[PDB]
């Protein structure tokens, strides 16, 4: 909605998304995905492959460990490429996603905890950074995703 939400210089990760309490959206034509499913706006810098993970009724790493969409329609899904802001030649590892949970989330449950989970015989961090290189394919370039709800 507001310009401050969409034009934020610093934008939060997939797991720790921060919420805030229309003709330009239609005619901007920079939005790669335009499917519309108080004003709260969420914060996703998910990969281009994982843009389709922000949709009801599916599975995946984001869909079953990160932010989850319930089985009803509430808001609008917007997404655009961001290879110029948060993608570098040496990589931009400033965004994290949650690779594993003990149980699948509730339709809007969120946790920003930093626990180590068991892999093999060692304990490793459940938060892994995103490799956002500028010279990467469309499925691996950073996509700036905002969903909304009222």
């Amino acid at each position: 909605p507001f310009s401050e939400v969409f034009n934020a210089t610093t934008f939060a990760s997939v797991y720790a998304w921060n919420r805030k309490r229309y003709s330009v959206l239609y005619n901007s034509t920079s939005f790669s995905t335009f499917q519309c499913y108080n004003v709260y706006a969420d914060s996703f810098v998910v990969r281009g492959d994982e843009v389709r993970q922000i949709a009801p009724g599916q599975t995946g790493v984001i869909a079953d460990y990160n932010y989850k969409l319930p089985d009803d329609f509430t808001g609008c899904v917007l997404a655009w490429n961001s290879r110029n802001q948060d993608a570098s030649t040496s990589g931009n590892f400033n965004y994290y996603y949650r690779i594993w949970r003990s149980e699948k989330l509730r339709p809007f449950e969120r946790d920003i905890a930093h626990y180590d989970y068991q892999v093999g015989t060692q304990f490793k961090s459940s938060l892994k950074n995103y490799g956002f290189y500028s010279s990467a394919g469309d499925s691996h370039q950073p996509y700036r995703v905002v969903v909304l709800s009222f």
């Binding site: 990589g91 093999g120 892994k128 010279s135 394919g137 691996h140």
Partner: protein, 698 residues
Amino acid sequence: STTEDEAKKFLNDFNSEAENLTYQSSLASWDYNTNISDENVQKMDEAGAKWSAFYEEQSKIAKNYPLEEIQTDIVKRQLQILQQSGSPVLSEDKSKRLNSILNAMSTIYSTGKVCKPNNPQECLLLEPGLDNIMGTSKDYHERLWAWEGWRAEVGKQLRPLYEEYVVLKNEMARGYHYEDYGDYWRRDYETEESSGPGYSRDQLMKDVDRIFTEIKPLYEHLHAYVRAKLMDTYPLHISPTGCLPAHLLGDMWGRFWTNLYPLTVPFGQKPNIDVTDEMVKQGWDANRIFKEAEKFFVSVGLPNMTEGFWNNSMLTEPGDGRKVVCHPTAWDLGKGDFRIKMCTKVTMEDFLTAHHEMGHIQYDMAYASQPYLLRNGANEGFHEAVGEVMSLSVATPKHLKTMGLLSPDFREDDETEINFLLKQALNIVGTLPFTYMLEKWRWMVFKGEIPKEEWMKKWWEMRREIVGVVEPVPHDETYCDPASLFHVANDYSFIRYYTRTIFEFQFHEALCRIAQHNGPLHKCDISNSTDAGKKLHQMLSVGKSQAWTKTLEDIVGSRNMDVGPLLRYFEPLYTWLQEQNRKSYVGWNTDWSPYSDQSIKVRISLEWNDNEMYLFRSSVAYAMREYFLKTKNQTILFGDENVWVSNLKPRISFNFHVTSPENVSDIIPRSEVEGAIRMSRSRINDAFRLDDNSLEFL
């Protein structure tokens, strides 16, 4: 809980870290390859060291997970790939010795030099100097010098290194629960498919033997035609019935017969297809060539090249001060980054090479959706088979006429088709017995069927009986002639080139059948055909997620490797070769040699070890010196190295012949050597404490 969930979690973490580490290593390698300098090599070194350490650590972790419990095929395949290669069981000194041996063999191969007989300051390397001689020269003696200087100044250095390398690699492969290093190389083409008949490692050996027995008649007729053709340019060196000398085959190893095309061309007045003039006309550049290749791949229904591909790839040689390697390569960097690095000149060869590398890139983009372990070809031959089949479909004269590159006034008669098919067969059919025989020799060496004292004997035995190629100079166990090839000295498998041709022509026949081609198979173009492209994309999408037999049965309808499409491709050429080989002899005998007519049989009648061989060679050289001094008044310094021993039974008999010093091609006539033995019979007979009845000298 259950271990397959733990395996899934471990595989997810491994993919998440590996897609990052390998992308960084690929970026460093690209930065070095497009910009050669210092402070760029060590970046690749540290990136590759980090990736290798991570890979071996995760392989040691993956060895914990059992495979017989897991029922899901994808995770089982990924774990099999992870567990098949890891940290070797070799000790630190053994691993260091193996690395030193490999580096020494590579350095000897790359930096070895051969000096001319006269002018010892003129020494030629392999790549700019000796390759030009073996590819272009029509002189028997210069080719013989270049062929014999190699494998003697270089292969003799590689013989003990290869002897230790075989033992070390056999120990390393036995530590991986394999019989030998050949079985470890044949761990590819190994499937665990359903219903019971999984492809085993011995099935590959059985199949390549069957394929060679099926291609033997066409290769025999091509061999007879080539022998009859170069009997004209080497009139007094080629036997009409015997094998071909190894140094008259277009290169030093006889791998490809392509350079023999000007010698063996039928209908030489007919010009070959070459559209290089039409591309230096019409303003064709590198970008035009790659856009035409992209248009060809769009026409079958494959996706476009990515926007990053046109930006980041090195489609032409850089004009600034950035040294590069000028080898055409298609790069799958990872994370959707696909680039082509080649120095494109405006030539038809670069046009076909651009199509080949775009085929590689299309394969990469097709299997990029798979997990990282499965992002490869179905086996090691599939990738190059796909590249070569796209290059095959592109290079038709119909395609060039459709593009407007070839003039429409050109007429395709039966003479030009025969020339094209023969030029294809010198590269495709002529390389198959050599590849099969070399891989067979390496498999029997690693297995232990060939003992260390019979390496050269067995090698030059199957060279005569399989390839139909005879050595011009006898080679004892001090030589290492396989190690004179790049892939043997640099530890590379060779059967992928054998299977590439079979899979390539199988794919060509299948795609031409789908694209409703009705004429001969060699005049088929799959352009603007969406069904052939759809089935090709279905084949390319499954990288390693299933068995290669299942993918092959999906695309061509057969679960096994079949050479029938290859014989159907060369059928008009086979008929023409059978017509031409009517007054000639088809086949070869393994008895004739260039030195066989002038050799003298020596029968040992009675401890005749290698020192007695040396004393015999020295006595023969002294007799030759005395004969040439006392008969022709010539001072020729014959040595023990100028006496060549062949057909050596261990204590029964052998054959010997004498060559001149400084001219290995100049074999002394048998009458001269017989007179030399007769004149100096007393010293030769007395030096071994025997009479003339013991040493027959027939």
